Short mmCIF file of C-alpha atoms and ligand atoms in Angstrom, two decimals:
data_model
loop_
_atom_site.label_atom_id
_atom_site.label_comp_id
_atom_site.label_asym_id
_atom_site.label_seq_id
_atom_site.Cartn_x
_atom_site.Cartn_y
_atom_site.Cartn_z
CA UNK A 714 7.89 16.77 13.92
CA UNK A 715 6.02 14.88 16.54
CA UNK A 716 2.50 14.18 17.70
CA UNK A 717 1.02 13.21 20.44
CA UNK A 718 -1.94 10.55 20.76
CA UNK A 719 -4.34 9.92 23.84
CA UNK A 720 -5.73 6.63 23.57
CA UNK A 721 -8.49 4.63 25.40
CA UNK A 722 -7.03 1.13 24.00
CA UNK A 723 -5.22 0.28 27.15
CA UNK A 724 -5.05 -3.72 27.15
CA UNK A 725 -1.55 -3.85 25.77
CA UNK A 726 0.67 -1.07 24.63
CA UNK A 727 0.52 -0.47 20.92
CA UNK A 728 3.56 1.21 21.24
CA UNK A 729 4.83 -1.50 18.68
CA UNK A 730 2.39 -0.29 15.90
CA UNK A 731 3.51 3.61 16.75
CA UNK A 732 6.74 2.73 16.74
CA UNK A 733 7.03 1.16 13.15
CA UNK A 734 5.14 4.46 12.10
CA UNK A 735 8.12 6.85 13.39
CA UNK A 736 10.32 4.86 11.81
CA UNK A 737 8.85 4.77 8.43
CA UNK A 738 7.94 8.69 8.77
CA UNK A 739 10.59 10.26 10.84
CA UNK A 740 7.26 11.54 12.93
CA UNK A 741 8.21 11.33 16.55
CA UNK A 742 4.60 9.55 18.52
CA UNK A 743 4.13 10.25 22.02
CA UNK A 744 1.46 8.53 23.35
CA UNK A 745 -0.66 7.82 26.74
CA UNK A 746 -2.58 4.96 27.19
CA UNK A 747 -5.30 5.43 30.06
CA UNK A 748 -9.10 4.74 30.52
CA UNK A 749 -11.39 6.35 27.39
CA UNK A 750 -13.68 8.09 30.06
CA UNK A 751 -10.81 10.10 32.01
CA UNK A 752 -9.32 11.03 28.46
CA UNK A 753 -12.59 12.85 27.63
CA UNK A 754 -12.88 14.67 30.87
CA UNK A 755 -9.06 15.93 30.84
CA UNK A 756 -9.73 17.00 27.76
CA UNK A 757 -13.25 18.61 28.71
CA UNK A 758 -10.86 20.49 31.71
CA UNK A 759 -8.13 21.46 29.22
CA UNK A 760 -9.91 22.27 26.44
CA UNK A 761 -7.44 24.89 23.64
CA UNK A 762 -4.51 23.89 26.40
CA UNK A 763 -4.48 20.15 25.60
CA UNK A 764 -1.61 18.41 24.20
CA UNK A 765 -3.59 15.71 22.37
CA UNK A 766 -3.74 15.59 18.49
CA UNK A 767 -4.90 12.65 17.65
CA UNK A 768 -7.51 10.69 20.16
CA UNK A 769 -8.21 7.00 20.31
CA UNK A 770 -11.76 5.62 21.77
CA UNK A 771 -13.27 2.19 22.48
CA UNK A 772 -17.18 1.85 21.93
CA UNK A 773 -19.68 3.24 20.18
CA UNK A 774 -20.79 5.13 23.46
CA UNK A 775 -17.85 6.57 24.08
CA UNK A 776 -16.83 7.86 20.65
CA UNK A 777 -20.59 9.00 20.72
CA UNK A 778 -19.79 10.87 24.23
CA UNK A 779 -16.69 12.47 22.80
CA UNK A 780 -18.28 13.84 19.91
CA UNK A 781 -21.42 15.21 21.91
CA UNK A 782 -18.68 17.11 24.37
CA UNK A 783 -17.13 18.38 20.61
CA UNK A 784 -13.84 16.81 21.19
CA UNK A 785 -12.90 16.16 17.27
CA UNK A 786 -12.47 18.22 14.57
CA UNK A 787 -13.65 17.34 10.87
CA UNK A 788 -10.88 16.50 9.00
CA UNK A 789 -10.61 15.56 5.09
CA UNK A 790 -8.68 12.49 3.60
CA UNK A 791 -9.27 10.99 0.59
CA UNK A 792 -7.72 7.94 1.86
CA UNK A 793 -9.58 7.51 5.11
CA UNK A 794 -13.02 8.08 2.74
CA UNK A 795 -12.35 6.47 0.00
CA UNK A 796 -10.80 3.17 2.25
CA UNK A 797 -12.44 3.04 6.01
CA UNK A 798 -16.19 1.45 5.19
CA UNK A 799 -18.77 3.73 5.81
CA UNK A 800 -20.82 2.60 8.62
CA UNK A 801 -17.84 2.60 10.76
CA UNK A 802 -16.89 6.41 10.28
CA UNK A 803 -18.66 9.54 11.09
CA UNK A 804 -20.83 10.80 8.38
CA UNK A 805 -19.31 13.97 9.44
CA UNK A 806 -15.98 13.22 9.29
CA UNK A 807 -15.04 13.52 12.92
CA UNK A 808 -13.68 10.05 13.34
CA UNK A 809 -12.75 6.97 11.77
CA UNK A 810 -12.86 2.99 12.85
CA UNK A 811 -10.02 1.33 13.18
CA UNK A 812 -10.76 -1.98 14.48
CA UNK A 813 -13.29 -4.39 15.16
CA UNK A 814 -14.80 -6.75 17.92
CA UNK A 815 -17.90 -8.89 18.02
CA UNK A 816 -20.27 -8.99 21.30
CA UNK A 817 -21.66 -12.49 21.24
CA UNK A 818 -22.84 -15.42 23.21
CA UNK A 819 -20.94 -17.80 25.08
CA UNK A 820 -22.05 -21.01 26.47
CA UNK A 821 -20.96 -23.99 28.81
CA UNK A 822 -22.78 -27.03 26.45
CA UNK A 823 -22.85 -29.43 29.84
CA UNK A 824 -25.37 -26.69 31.55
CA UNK A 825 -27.35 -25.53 28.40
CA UNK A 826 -28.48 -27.20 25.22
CA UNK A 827 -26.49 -25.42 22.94
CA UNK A 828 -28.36 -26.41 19.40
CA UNK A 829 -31.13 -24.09 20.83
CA UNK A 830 -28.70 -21.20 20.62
CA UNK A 831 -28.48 -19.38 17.60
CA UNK A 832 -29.12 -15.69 17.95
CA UNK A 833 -29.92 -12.91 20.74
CA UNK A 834 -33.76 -13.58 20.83
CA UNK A 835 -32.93 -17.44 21.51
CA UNK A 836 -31.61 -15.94 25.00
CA UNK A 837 -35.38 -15.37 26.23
CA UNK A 838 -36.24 -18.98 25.97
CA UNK A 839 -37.50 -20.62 29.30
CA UNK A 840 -35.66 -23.46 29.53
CA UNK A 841 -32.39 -20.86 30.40
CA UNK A 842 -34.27 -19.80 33.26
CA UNK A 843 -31.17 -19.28 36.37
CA UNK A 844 -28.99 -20.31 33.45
CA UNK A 845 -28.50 -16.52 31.99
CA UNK A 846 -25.52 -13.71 33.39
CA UNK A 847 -24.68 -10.75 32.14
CA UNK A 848 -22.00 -8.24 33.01
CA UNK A 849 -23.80 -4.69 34.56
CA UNK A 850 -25.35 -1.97 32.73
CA UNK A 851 -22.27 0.27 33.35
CA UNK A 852 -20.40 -1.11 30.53
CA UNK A 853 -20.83 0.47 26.89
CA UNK A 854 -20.41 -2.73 25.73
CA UNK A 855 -23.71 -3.67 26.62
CA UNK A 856 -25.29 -0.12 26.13
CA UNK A 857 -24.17 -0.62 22.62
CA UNK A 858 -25.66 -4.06 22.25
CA UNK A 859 -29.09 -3.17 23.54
CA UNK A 860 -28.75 -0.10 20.87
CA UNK A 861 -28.61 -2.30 18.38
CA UNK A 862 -31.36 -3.49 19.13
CA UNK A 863 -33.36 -0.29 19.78
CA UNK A 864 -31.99 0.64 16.11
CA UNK A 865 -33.15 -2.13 13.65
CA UNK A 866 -36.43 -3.07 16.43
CA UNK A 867 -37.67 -0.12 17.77
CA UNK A 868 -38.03 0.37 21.57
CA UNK A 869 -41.11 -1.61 22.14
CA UNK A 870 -39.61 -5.03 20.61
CA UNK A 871 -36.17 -4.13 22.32
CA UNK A 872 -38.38 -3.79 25.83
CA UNK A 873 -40.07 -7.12 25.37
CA UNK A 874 -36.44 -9.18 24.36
CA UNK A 875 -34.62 -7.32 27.65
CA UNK A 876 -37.79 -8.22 29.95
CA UNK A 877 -37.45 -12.11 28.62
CA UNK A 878 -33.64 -11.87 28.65
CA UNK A 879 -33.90 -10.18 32.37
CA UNK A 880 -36.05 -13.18 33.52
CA UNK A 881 -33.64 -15.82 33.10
CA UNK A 882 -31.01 -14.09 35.20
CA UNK A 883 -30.41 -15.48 38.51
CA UNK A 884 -27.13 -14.43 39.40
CA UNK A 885 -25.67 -11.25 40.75
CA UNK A 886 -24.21 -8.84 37.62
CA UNK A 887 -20.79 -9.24 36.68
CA UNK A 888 -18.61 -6.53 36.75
CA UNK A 889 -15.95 -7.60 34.24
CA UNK A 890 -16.54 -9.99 30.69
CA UNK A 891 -13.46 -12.14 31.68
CA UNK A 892 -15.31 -13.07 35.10
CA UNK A 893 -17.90 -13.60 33.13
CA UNK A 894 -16.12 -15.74 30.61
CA UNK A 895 -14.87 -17.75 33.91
CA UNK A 896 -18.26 -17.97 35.31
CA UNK A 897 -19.38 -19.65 32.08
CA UNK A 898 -16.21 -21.84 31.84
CA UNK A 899 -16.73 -22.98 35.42
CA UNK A 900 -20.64 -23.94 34.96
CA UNK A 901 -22.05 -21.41 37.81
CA UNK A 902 -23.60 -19.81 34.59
CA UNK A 903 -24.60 -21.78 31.37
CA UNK A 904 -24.57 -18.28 29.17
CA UNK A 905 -23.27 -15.23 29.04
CA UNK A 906 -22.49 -12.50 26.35
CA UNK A 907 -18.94 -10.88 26.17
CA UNK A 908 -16.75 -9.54 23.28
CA UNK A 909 -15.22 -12.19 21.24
CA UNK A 910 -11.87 -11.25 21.85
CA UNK A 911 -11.62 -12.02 25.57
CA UNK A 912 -12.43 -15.39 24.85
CA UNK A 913 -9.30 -15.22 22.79
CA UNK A 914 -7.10 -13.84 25.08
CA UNK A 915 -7.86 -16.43 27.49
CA UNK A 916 -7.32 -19.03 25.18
CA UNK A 917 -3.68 -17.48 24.05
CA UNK A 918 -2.84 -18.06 27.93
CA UNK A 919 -2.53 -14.37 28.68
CA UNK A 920 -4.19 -14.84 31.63
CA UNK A 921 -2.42 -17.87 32.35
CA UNK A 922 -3.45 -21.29 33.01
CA UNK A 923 -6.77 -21.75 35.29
CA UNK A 924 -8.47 -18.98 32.65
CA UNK A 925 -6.84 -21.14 29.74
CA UNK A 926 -8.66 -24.16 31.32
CA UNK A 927 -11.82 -22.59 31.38
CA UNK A 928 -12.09 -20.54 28.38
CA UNK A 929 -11.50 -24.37 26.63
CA UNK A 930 -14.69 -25.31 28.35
CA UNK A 931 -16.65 -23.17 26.43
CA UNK A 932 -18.79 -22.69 23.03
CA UNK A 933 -18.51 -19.47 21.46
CA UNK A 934 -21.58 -18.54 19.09
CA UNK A 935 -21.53 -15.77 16.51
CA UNK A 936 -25.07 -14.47 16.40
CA UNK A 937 -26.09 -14.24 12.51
CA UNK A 938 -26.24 -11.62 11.42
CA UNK A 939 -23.57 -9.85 13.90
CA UNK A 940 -23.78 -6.65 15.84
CA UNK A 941 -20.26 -5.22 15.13
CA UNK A 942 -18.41 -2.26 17.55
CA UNK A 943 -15.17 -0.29 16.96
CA UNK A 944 -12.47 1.51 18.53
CA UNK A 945 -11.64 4.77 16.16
CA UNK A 946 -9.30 7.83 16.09
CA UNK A 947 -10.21 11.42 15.27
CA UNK A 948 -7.84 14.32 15.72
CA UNK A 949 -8.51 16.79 18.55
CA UNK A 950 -10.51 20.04 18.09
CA UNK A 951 -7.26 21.91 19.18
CA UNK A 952 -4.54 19.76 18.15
CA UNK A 953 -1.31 21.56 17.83
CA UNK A 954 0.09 18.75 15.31
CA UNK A 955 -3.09 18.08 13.19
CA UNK A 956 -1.11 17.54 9.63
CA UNK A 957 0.65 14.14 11.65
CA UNK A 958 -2.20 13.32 13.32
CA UNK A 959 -4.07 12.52 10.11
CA UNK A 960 -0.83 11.03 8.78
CA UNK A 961 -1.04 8.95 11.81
CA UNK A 962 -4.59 8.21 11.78
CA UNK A 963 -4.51 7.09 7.66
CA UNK A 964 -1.77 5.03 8.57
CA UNK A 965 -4.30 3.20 11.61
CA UNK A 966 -6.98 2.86 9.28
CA UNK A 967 -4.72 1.33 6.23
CA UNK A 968 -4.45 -2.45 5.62
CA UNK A 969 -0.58 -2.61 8.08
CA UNK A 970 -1.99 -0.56 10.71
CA UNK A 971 -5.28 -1.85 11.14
CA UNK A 972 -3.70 -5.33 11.08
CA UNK A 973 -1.14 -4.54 13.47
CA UNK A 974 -3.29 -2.69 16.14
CA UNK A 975 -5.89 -5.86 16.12
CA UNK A 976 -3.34 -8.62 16.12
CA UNK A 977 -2.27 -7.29 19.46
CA UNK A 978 -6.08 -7.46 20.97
CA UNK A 979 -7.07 -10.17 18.62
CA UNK A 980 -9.59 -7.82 17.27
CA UNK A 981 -10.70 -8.02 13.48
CA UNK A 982 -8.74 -5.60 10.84
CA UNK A 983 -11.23 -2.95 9.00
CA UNK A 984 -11.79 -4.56 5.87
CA UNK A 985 -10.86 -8.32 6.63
CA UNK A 986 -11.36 -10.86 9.31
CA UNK A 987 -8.64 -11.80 11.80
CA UNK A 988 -6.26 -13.72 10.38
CA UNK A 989 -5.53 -15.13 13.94
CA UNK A 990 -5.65 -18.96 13.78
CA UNK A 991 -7.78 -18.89 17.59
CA UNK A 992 -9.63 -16.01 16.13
CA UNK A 993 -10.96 -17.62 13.48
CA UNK A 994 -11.64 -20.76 14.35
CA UNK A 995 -14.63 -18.67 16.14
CA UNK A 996 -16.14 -19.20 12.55
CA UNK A 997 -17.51 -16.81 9.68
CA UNK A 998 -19.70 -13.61 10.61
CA UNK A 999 -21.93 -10.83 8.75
CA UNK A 1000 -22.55 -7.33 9.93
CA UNK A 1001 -26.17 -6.59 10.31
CA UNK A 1002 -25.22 -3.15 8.98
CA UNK A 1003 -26.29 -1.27 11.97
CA UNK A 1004 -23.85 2.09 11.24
CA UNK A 1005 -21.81 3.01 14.51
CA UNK A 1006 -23.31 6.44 14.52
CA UNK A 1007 -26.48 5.06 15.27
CA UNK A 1008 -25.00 3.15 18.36
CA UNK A 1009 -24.19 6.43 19.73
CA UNK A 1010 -27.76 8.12 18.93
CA UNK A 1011 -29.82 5.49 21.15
CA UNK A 1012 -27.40 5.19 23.77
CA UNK A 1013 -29.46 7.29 26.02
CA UNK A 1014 -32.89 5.16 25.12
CA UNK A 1015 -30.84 1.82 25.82
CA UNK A 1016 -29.77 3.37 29.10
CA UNK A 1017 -33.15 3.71 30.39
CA UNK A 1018 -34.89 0.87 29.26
CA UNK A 1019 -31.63 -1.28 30.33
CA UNK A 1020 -32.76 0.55 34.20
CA UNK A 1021 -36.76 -0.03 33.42
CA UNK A 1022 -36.33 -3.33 33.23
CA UNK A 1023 -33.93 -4.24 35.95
CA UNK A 1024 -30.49 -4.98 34.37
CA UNK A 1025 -28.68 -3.41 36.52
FE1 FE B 2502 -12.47 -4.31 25.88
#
């Protein structure tokens, strides 16, 4: 017995978290661990000559581009409905969260008054004027941020907020959030917005010590309430192996899995916040309830208002 998972969470092997799952099933995992984006389009190419059961995504806009190019099939598990919450599943059953990250603001308090910083919409204020970077429009990341917006706002509010937000950038798009985070650390930029757990990478020394250095420099703010993204699993349209792939995936999605895969990208669990000491100390946080399905439907609408506007 064996199955075979192509996953987009390519940081930091979780071969560890596979691993302890063969050994308490007997299920043999081989896994990849590649770019999201070149998963989907081997997978377009194959199509019924894949390998892939089970298939691992980061970002709303990605699990939405897998499911528009019909890359899952609907499974059933009472476990993964009755325990995965449900704005962070497919209301069709096609795929499941598995983990959690936060994109919020970060903030060098020597450049920018940092009491005047509590949410998104505190961004446009005037006083950040040359004081505001952003990584480019090419990450999902910050698609799925701006369709958050577009979800709970509408498109007209979202447009004014990105034309305020747009007008205090001075300073060339980053390409990357940890430049970003180093950007902010340094002082060249008093704010940015990355996911929370690159600040806690940095912090951990993974990046060793000048990124260390500056990631200490810097206040991390958890907009209230929180826009929350996910990585999740589904099990290929074809797979070969699809009994262990949903063994597999209900083992992700349950309280060790879900634990284990976040520990290793100091990601939040499912149902429970990181238990990570660095994590944590990043403070308290509530969803705003925006379901991850609806980060996929106005990815297209955040795409063009994100060009309208000039973030580019
Ligand atoms: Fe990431």
């Amino acid at each position: 017995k064996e199955v075979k998972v192509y996953s987009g969470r390519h940081y930091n092997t979780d071969k560890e978290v596979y691993q302890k799952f063969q050994e308490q099933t007997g299920i043999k995992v081989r896994y990849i661990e590649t770019d999201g984006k070149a998963i989907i389009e081997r997978l377009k190419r194959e199509g019924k000559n894949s390998q892939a059961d089970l298939v691992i995504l980061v970002d709303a806009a990605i699990i939405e581009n897998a499911s528009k190019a019909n890359l899952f099939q609907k499974i059933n598990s009472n476990f993964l409905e009755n325990s995965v919450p449900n704005n962070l599943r497919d209301p069709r059953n096609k795929w499941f969260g598995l983990t959690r990250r936060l994109r919020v603001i970060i903030s060098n308090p020597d450049i920018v008054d940092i009491t005047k910083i509590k949410n998104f919409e505190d961004l446009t204020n005037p006083s950040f004027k040359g004081k505001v970077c952003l990584r480019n429009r090419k990450s999902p990341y910050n698609q799925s941020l701006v369709s958050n917006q577009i979800a709970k706002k509408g498109v007209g509010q979202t447009k004014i907020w990105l034309k305020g937000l747009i007008s205090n950038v001075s300073t060339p798009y980053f390409s990357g959030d940890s430049s970003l985070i180093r950007a902010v650390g340094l002082g060249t930029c008093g704010i940015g917005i990355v996911n929370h757990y690159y600040v806690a990478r940095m912090l951990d020394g993974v990046k060793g010590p000048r990124d260390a250095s500056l990631a200490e420099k810097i206040k991390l703010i958890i907009p209230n309430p929180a826009h929350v993204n996910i990585t999740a699993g589904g099990v290929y349209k074809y797979a070969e192996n699809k009994t262990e792939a949903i063994k597999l995936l209900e083992y992700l999605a349950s309280s060790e899995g879900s634990q284990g895969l976040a520990n290793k990208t100091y990601e939040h669990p499912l149902k429970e916040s990181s238990q990570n000491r660095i994590v944590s100390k990043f403070g308290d946080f509530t969803p705003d309830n925006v379901t991850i399905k609806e980060l996929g439907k106005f990815n297209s609408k955040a795409i063009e208002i994100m060009k309208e506007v000039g973030w580019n």
